[PDB]
Symmetry: D2
Subunit: 331 residues, 4 copies
Amino acid sequence: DPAPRLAGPPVFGGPGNDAFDLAPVRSTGREMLRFDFPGVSIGAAHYEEGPTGATVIHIPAGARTAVDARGGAVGLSGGYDFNHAICLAGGAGYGLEAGAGVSKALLERLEHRTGFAELQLVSSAVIYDFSARSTAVYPDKALGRAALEFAVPGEFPQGRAGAGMSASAGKVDWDRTEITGQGAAFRRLGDVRILAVVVPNPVGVIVDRAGTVVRGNYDAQTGVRRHPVFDYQEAFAEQVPPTTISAIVTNVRMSPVELNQFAKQVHSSMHRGIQPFHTDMDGDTLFAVTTDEIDLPTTPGSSRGRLSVNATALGAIASEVMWDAVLEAGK
Amino acid sequence: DPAPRLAGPPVFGGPGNDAFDLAPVRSTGREMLRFDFPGVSIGAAHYEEGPTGATVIHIPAGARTAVDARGGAVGLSGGYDFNHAICLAGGAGYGLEAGAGVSKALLERLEHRTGFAELQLVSSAVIYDFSARSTAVYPDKALGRAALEFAVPGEFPQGRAGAGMSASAGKVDWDRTEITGQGAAFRRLGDVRILAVVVPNPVGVIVDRAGTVVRGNYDAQTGVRRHPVFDYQEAFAEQVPPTTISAIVTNVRMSPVELNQFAKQVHSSMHRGIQPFHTDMDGDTLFAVTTDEIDLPTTPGSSRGRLSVNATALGAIASEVMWDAVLEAGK
Amino acid sequence: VDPAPRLAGPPVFGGPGNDAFDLAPVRSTGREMLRFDFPGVSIGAAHYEEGPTGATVIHIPAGARTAVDARGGAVGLSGGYDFNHAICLAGGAGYGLEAGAGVSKALLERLEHRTGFAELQLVSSAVIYDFSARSTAVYPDKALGRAALEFAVPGEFPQGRAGAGMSASAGKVDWDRTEITGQGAAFRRLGDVRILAVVVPNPVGVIVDRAGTVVRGNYDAQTGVRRHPVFDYQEAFAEQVPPTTISAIVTNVRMSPVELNQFAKQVHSSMHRGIQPFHTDMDGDTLFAVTTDEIDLPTTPGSSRGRLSVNATALGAIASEVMWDAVLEAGK
Amino acid sequence: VDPAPRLAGPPVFGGPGNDAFDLAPVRSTGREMLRFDFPGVSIGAAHYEEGPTGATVIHIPAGARTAVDARGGAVGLSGGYDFNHAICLAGGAGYGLEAGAGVSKALLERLEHRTGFAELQLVSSAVIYDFSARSTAVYPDKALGRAALEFAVPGEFPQGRAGAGMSASAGKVDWDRTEITGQGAAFRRLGDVRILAVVVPNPVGVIVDRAGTVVRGNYDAQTGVRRHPVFDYQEAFAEQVPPTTISAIVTNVRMSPVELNQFAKQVHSSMHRGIQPFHTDMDGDTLFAVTTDEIDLPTTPGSSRGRLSVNATALGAIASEVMWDAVLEAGK
């Protein structure tokens, strides 16, 4: 399948933010996805000195959100039920600082108004990306501000860009871990729009629709990637005894209850493309965001079935958009 | 692939429990799985008049449990963190009564002692199985008692047995829904034992490791099963605008936190074999149970990797046992 | 005058079970009947004298949106649905969840055994452990839940030793100081806003009045008075470490699922005023907040008494007082 | 004598922001210093006079197991980790979560920028909305969190208008009746058992003493007294419907994750005694329960004061009293 991108051995010892004169770089990745979703903008910035970065989804009007912080090792700030931005970043818990840069910028744009109903709400989540490089540089307040300032409608930089700079997969053993990236995908169906954004830094591996392992757990001794379960099961036989952060953004009106269950459904669906997933070693966090523009019909019928047009249906479609995004990240 | 088992059109109008002289039947299914797991017994009973039934996992010593009630339409009783039995049943919420039959029987065996530390704890979960038949008979207290009385070590009746009598899959449209069953699978690795039991009554369909839809959403007009997303996406393009209950039982000691995250991981993994899953229309509930007999090593290394022997590893292995069980249920 | 003691006495933790008796449900009348005006809500309470133990059922045939706040560490809950035709509160620990099955079956029969989704009859049940307060193993069974439903009437509630409250008790630092409580209810109408509180306090803690006086539980027969448990706990630590309550709040005010859920949490927390300690590992405290969705609040929350005075929080504060009154009726 | 009023005054909801000022952190001293003996725990409090607003940091360099009970409807939380090297409490609403980033960065520097898993420095942060209580938009920023950490010392806590409590306020039925609170702490030692409570009450509700008297918040300048909010709420309903608190409890007693989580819930609920209403939709109430894992309780829970007297519930009841004392210090 694809050529290996082995991350290589941990190097710990390296310089931190203050050691450098750090210039934000607008991330372009390997290619740009273009899409049509008015009211949603995306910016991505990185420090070459990491390499590490942040990716910001800006919805200036604000949008209702559900968070499904399903992993065992989550790094989350805010996790609000209504957001003006979502900030995804490297740097482990230190990278939550990037969201502060976004928040301050939005406060300035609001002319420092502070009424309850005009608080600018930014939710942030992070990946641990320090094993995939040899510095301690992290996404700081300045980098989050830059990613917001770089945000534009209808573009997403695929691959090694923003939060995906140093994302990696397949962590049974660090000698077999491979660099991933970030990914996005978009579908429009009638008036319905669905955007998926993902930064897969899994303990598990990326798996395609045929069941092929396409990124992570690559053994240079064999030239082949293995599903982790094969390693795990042999490890048990031998010895006993002897994070992915993501967002799904849509324009379909969903109640708080529908939106929450939609988040759970889409998030669980990602165990198709990332295996294992939702593990104690992962901090998997999905944000489900709706711009509340399009009604679903009051009854769920169509020529395709009596129960074919509802939030579960939307969840199933969004799950496919998200798998496409995961595969873009691993490409 | 497999021959269709279409459930056929809803028939509502039918007789309930009191209309019959109801005799419990010991369920044998299509075949018996045999396995070696001392301290775990399984019983299954049904009423032919439904057809509907209950399946009971009895662990007389009691075992630590985590519950992951992830679906939007859950029918759960007890949901305790320590159980002497798990009762899975048809009959929608009415079938929770079967667990009372189990509980009373266990109280009688305890000679009606009622100290806090000898309370007999039964957690129960249910599927809605009324659309797959033409009666209102449900698993009652007598049926739960019978399933417990029928419990034996090391046997599980596959297929149309116990709670699986009238389980069905693929509910975009009732004309395409197919009867499933219940299923189990077992693996032993070194001293580690993992038993998976499942009663798939999903809105979604059963999918095999190649990605083939093997049960549910069968169209008699074409002779072919479809993944629901194909129906959903065309329904949206047209109109906008114009439950699985399961248990994983193991003998590996896990702390409450490990056991809870293990439950979440294994449950999410089932979105590989059941698609969609964890939907608002489903009451998906997984019980993760440990008999707390075997330690994992204090450090997680083996020849297969530095991070290869831990609870996440066990979760990945258990996820495969569960997929095997789902495929047995759909066979 | 301090209330007279109602010590439960020393627990044996067992005795004869249900089938040792020819169990006839008794309609519970308690010590007094509360009467109130809330069409669409009926309450029935039944007991077995042979326990003594019982069940109390709230029946809302329209069905009503519900939030559950299962806050305690030792909860016994069935269903816990976000929409219910009945709530069943019972003794008998986990065994007493069976009473709810009796309610469910009876409701299925009233529905002529129809089983379409819209027709499924939804009963949520919660239990207290009441076996220390008596010397039998009798529990609320399917027949007792059915009886409690059949006895249900609008506008009445039997206070005291009635239904689920038959063998409820408080103050469990030591069983020698535990006292029988009861069940309790209170009701307020503000114009057409209606709030009903029902409670079955079986706390590890004690019942406390609005002055901060301990009024039920932790009665020391050697002193003739009730102290707050914390006095015992702090003395215990100095010595040895040297150097359930089930409840419902029912209202007719429309609240969204989000509002109703937070209203449940607020009202439930408020009960740590009248029950102390509360929400402990030893307790299975469960509150059901139910709205019959009859009355909207104004779109904006202002009044002469303030800019933020008419909203679900406000309703929660009022409901919290109704619930404290119900707790005090249970302890009376 | 009833306490003198400390009305916050009418809110403008905006003003100059951080960069309009040359902001120098000030070490907060408050009205009084609490002194106590708990090695391994340091507290620092810093403010900007230009807000006025501040941050209070609890630093536990060993790291400590933590349970978070984010019970309010309007929570502002970062991290919420089950193991923490620091807890940062701040004003500035969601913007003030930035102070925790300053703590985290400073701790990374102390660790010589090591980034192995075992070395990750974990800071959980929570905030109050304190913008109604002043006419600026200044918030606790990265520099202020750093300063609060640098000012942290063992065995001291500045009571009153200090750190996160600079512009905390209570009683928000109407802003004309809202009063400045402060932050508060209390400490108890029972032998070698140690319990520290820290609280920053910014409630929608009011502070209530052990007699049931409202002592801070909802002061009506037309009457000269404070009433419980429920009086306003019930009058508001009759008229118009005609027919955050952030806190930490730190102990040295070993509790398992399950015990510690239920202990957090218990102690948090107990605060509805001293803050009423509490846990409302309008509030972002968040409690951190932290154990330094130094002392085991006995294996069995007996003492002369009862068979169930020495356990995590008992500790929770004692800790609940320490926390009420801290709330009253904040309101004093």
